[PDB]
Design brief:
It is classed as rna binding protein/rna. Keywords: Piwi protein, Pi-RNA, Argonaute, RNA binding protein/RNA, RNA BINDING PROTEIN-RNA complex. It forms a trimeric assembly. Cryo-EM Structure of MILI(K853A)-piRNA-target. The chain is α+β, with helices and mostly antiparallel strands. The protein has 4 domains: 185 residues, no CATH class; 110 residues, paz domain, CATH 2.170.260; 125 residues, Response regulator (Rossmann fold, 3-Layer(aba) Sandwich); 231 residues, Nucleotidyltransferase, domain 5. Helices cover 27% and strands 26% of the residues. The protein contains 17 helices and 37 strands. Strand 16 and strand 17 form a beta hairpin. The protein binds magnesium ion. The structure holds a RNA duplex.
RNA sequence: UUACCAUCAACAUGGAAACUUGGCUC
RNA sequence: GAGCCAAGUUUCCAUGUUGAUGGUA
C-alpha cells in the first residue's frame, strides 16, 4: 500500500525484472456469498457450470471457487435458486446467502483476486496440477520414459508495498502420462507373478495425484478385494457406487471396473480415502531415468531457465492472456487490466566486502569467490597440529596416502604446521571398529587435536556415530572425509585445501574476517529444526559471536518439549552466551543482532509479539542489562526471480543485489537480498524481515551487516545466501537433531566443531 | 558426509476467509 | 443473539527440509 522509505545510499543502481501488476481497481464493491448445494456435490466443474446457468439472476460477472461466490451487485439476504443436474436432472436447491461485503481495495479480496485470476488464466486452457496451472499444448514429451513436462506458471496475486501484484514464476510440472492403472499395466506386463509385491513396494509411500480434483495422496495401501462397483458413503449417510459418484457427481466415465483401490490414511482427519488408479497418475522423475545422462540433461537444461527464458515464458503468458478475447473480457469485467510487460525496478548492488587475513587483506572479485585467493596466503589464526590421527580402512592405502602427502604440500602457504599423523588402519567398515579405535586411542593419548576419518560410500548411521562419539561422549574435534571425494586426483588440490581449512576451523583456528563498521556488537543466529521422526522436538541451535572481530562463535543448543514455550531454554542460551562474552571481552555488548530461521509468514506476529518480549524480559538475569536488540527473520523465499537488464536481453543478477521496495511486505521494514553467486537459473533472493530494531539501525546498515555476515561463513570460501550465524545454527540444529540427539559438550563449544 | 548454488518430485507446518459440527455463554 | 474455545471441509496462500539431478571450486 503505502510506500515505505527503506532505501540506502551506497551501492550501484541495477535494473531488475520482476512479477506482473494489473489491479488498478475499478470494481465498486465485492459481495461474498456462500453457496449450499443440496444434495451435496463437491466437483467444481459442473458446480461452476450450474452457477453459470443462473446468469439471469446472478449476473454474468461472477467469481466462483466451488463454495464461495463473488458478485459486484448485491442480492437478497437469501436466494433460493433451482438448478437441474446435467447428468440425471436432479433438482438441486442453491442457497446464495450473503456472508460478507468486501471492499475491493482491502486484503480480504486477495483470495477473490486469486480466484478470478485462476478463472482468467484457466480460460487460456491451462490445466490444474497441484497448486498451479500448466500449459499442456506448449509441452515437451519424453517418450523414452513416458513423461511430459508442461511449462506453466505458479501465479498468485499478492499485495506488496509498491502495489497489488501478480507474482508469476515459471514452474515446470512433471506429468507422468501413464496413470497408476497404466503403470500397473506396464508392471503386469513386466512382472507376472510378483506384480502385486513390486507394485506395492513401488507404490506405497509414493505420491499419486488425482487430476479431476488435482489432489495429491501418499499411497498408504492398495486394496484389491474392493472394486469400484461397490458403494461408499457420500459424507452425510448416503451409499453410492464409485461409477455413480463419478458420473452423477463428477460427470466423467470410469472405463475399467476391475481396478483396485488406493488407500491414503491421513494424520491422526481419520478416514480411509479410496482412490481410482485410472484417474490417479504418478508424479516424479522415474527411477529408471535419473541415472540416464541425456534425459536429465534435457530436463535440467530446460528447467535451468536463464532470465531471458524466464521472462520469455512470462511474456508468453501475457500475450496469451491479451490475445484471448474471452480471457481479457473475463478479467476486464471486474475492472482489472494487465500491463503490456513484466514490471521493472531499479534495485541496488551492495559493495564488495574485503576479506582480511593475517598479513594480506584482499578485496574480492565480481564473482565474489575467494577459493584460490585464501589458500596461498596465511590464515589469520592457525594453531599448529602435531599430534593428530587419520583413520582409513583396508581398501584405502593410496587415496589416504596421497591425501596426507598433498596436505603436507598445501599446508606451506596456508600456514598450518602439520605433522605426519597416526596411520590408523581400520580393520573393516562397521561401527564397532571405527568408534572403538577412536575412543581407545583417545583414552591413552590425551594430546590428540583432530581425529580425521575416511568413510567409504555414503552412510548416515556411521557418520552419526563418529560425530556422536566426538561431540557428546569424548569431546575432540573430528573431520569426516568421503572416499568418492578423493577419487579424482585432478581437482584434488582445492578440496584438500578446503578440508585443511575445515580442520583448522574445528580446532579453534580462525580463517578470515570482514571489516565490521560498528563496534562492540554480538551477532546471534538460531534455527528451529522441526522433527518429523522423533516426536516434535523443535531443537534450537544457537550461535553467538564472542569477540569484537566476530571470529569466535560460542554456540549452545537447547532442546524443546512438545508444546513448551522457548522461555526457560532460550533464556539459558542468552545468559550463557552473555556470560561467555563477559569472560572473553570483559564487558557487555551494546548490540545483539538476532537472526531467526524457520518462520512462515503466519508466524511473524507470533515471533514479533511473544518471543522478542520474552527474550528482552529474560535479559534481566543480570544487573541493569538492557542492550539494543535487533531481530531478523530469514526466509529463502523461492517464489521471486530477479532478472538483470542486459542491453539485448535478461541476464543473471550480480552477486549482492538487494531490493527494499515494491515486493516487500507492507507491515514490516524489510528487503530481499541476493548475496551469493548464482551461475545457473535465476537467483533466489533471501527475505530479511526486521521484526525488532531497538538499535535505531540505518536502512543501509542492515544490508551491509547482513552481507558482511554472508561473507563470514567459513565452510564455504565465498558469499552465501543466509548469514554466517544462520548457517552455523542451521548445521548446529542438524547436528543436534539428526545426528547428536543431545546437547554437545561445552568444551567443544568455543570452536566451530559443527562444520 | 570438502563445500556452496540452481531447479524439480514430494512431505510437513503455519496463517487468513467462508461454512459446518459440539461445548460454554448474557 | 453478541462473543470465545475445539475440530473438520473448501478456498487462497506462505515457509521449511527430505530425496534427486545438475552446475563450478
Ligand atoms: Mg530451518
Amino acid at each position: 500500500k503505502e510506500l515505505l522509505v527503506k532505501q540506502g545510499s551506497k551501492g550501484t543502481p541495477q535494473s531488475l525484472g520482476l512479477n506482473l501488476i494489473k489491479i488498478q481497481c475499478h470494481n465498486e464493491a465485492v459481495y461474498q456469498y456462500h453457496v449450499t448445494f443440496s444434495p451435496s456435490v463437491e466437483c467444481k466443474s459442473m458446480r461452476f457450470g450450474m452457477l453459470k446457468d443462473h446468469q439471469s439472476v446472478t449476473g454474468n460477472v461472477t467469481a466462483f471457487d466451488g463454495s464461495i461466490l463473488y458478485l459486484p451487485v448485491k442480492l437478497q439476504q437469501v436466494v433460493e435458486l433451482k438448478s437441474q443436474r446435467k447428468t440425471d436432472d436432479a433438482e438441486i436447491s442453491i442457497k446464495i446467502q450473503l456472508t460478507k461485503i468486501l471492499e475491493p481495495c482491502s486484503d480480504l479480496c486477495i483470495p477473490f483476486y486469486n480466484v478470478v485470476f485462476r478463472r482468467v488464466m484457466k480460460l487460456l486452457d491451462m490445466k490444474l496440477v497441484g497448486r498451479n496451472f500448466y500449459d499442456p499444448t506448449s509441452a515437451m514429451v519424453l517418450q523414452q520414459h513416458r513423461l511430459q513436462i508442461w511449462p506453466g506458471y505458479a501465479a498468485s496475486i499478492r499485495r506488496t508495498d509498491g502495489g497489488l501484484f501478480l507474482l508469476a514464476d515459471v514452474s515446470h510440472k512433471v506429468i507422468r502420462n501413464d496413470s497408476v492403472l497404466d503403470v500397473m499395466h506396464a508392471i503386469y506386463q513386466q512382472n507376472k507373478e510378483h506384480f502385486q509385491d513390486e507394485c506395492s513396494k513401488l507404490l506405497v509411500g509414493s505420491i499419486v495425484i488425482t487430476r479431476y480434483n488435482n489432489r495429491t495422496y501418499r499411497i498408504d495401501d492398495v486394496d484389491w478385494n474392493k472394486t469400484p462397483k461397490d458403494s461408499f458413503v457420500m459424507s452425510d449417510g448416503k451409499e453410492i457406487t464409485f461409477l455413480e459418484y463419478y458420473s452423477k457427481n463428477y460427470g466423467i466415465t470410469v472405463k475399467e471396473d476391475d481396478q483396485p483401490l488406493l488407500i491414503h490414511r491421513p494424520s491422526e482427519l481419520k478416514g480411509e480415502i479410496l482412490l481410482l488408479p485410472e484417474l490417479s497418475f504418478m508424479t516424479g522423475i522415474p527411477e529408471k531415468m535419473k541415472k540416464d545422462f541425456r534425459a536429465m540433461k534435457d530436463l535440467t537444461q530446460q528447467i535451468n531457465l536463464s532470465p531471458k527464458q524466464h521472462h520469455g515464458a512470462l511474456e508468453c503468458l501475457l500475450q496469451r492472456i491479451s490475445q484471448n478475447e474471452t480471457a481479457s473480457n473475463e478479467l476486464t469485467r471486474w475492472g482489472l487490466s494487465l500491463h503490456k510487460d513484466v514490471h521493472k525496478i531499479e534495485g541496488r548492488l551492495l559493495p564488495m566486502e574485503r576479506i582480511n587475513l593475517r598479513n594480506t587483506s584482499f578485496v574480492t572479485s565480481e564473482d565474489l569467490n575467494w577459493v584460490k585467493e585464501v589458500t596461498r596466503d596465511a590464515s589469520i589464526l592457525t594453531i599448529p597440529m602435531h599430534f593428530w590421527a587419520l583413520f582409513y580402512p583396508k581398501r584405502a592405502m593410496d587415496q589416504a596416502r596421497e591425501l596426507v602427502n598433498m596436505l603436507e604440500k598445501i599446508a606451506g602457504p596456508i600456514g598450518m604446521r602439520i605433522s605426519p599423523p597416526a596411520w590408523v588402519e581400520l580393520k573393516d567398515d562397521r561401527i564397532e571398529t571405527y568408534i572403538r579405535t577412536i575412543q581407545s586411542l583417545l583414552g591413552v593419548e590425551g594430546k590428540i587435536q583432530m581425529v580425521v576419518c575416511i568413510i567409504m560410500g555414503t552412510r548416515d548411521d556411521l557418520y552419526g556415530a563418529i560425530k556422536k562419539l566426538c561431540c557428546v561422549q569424548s569431546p575432540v574435534p573430528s573431520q569426516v572425509i568421503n572416499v568418492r571425494t578423493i577419487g579424482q586426483p585432478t581437482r584434488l588440490r582445492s578440496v584438500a585445501q578446503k578440508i585443511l581449512l575445515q580442520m583448522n576451523c574445528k580446532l579453534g583456528g580462525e580463517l578470515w574476517g570482514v571489516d565490521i563498521p560498528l563496534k562492540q556488537l554480538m551477532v546471534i543466529g538460531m534455527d528451529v529444526y522441526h522433527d518429523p521422526s522423533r516426536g516434535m522436538r523443535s531443537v534450537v541451535g544457537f550461535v553467538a559471536s564472542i569477540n569484537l572481530t566476530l571470529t569466535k562463535w560460542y554456540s549452545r543448543v537447547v532442546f524443546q518439549m512438545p508444546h513448551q514455550e522457548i522461555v526457560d531454554s532460550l533464556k539459558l542460551c542468552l545468559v550463557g552466551s552473555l556470560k561467555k562474552y563477559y569472560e572473553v571481552n570483559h564487558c557487555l555488548p551494546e548490540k545483539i543482532v538476532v537472526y531467526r530461521d524457520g518462520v512462515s509468514d503466519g508466524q511473524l506476529k507470533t515471533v514479533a509479539n511473544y518471543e522478542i518480549p520474552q527474550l528482552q524480559k529474560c535479559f534481566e538475569a543480570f544487573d541493569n542489562y538492557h542492550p539494543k536488540m535487533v531481530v531478523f527473520v530469514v526466509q529463502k523465499a523461492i517464489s521471486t526471480n530477479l532478472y538483470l537488464a542486459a542491453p539485448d536481453h535478461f541476464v543473471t543478477p550480480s552477486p549482492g543485489t538487494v531490493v527494499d521496495h515494491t515486493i516487500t511486505s507492507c507491515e514490516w521494514v524489510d528487503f530481499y537480498l541476493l548475496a551469493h553467486h548464482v551461475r545457473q537459473g535465476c537467483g533466489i533472493p533471501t527475505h530479511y524481515i526486521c521484526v525488532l530494531n531497538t538499535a535505531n539501525l540505518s536502512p543501509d546498515h542492515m544490508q551491509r551487516l547482513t552481507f558482511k555476515l554472508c561473507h563470514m561463513y567459513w565452510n564455504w570460501p565465498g558469499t552465501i545466501r543466509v548469514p554466517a550465524p544462520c548457517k552455523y545454527a542451521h548445521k548446529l540444529a542438524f547436528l543436534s537433531g539428526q545426528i547428536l540427539h543431545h546437547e554437545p559438550a561445552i568444551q567443544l563449544c568455543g570452536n566451530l566443531f559443527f562444520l
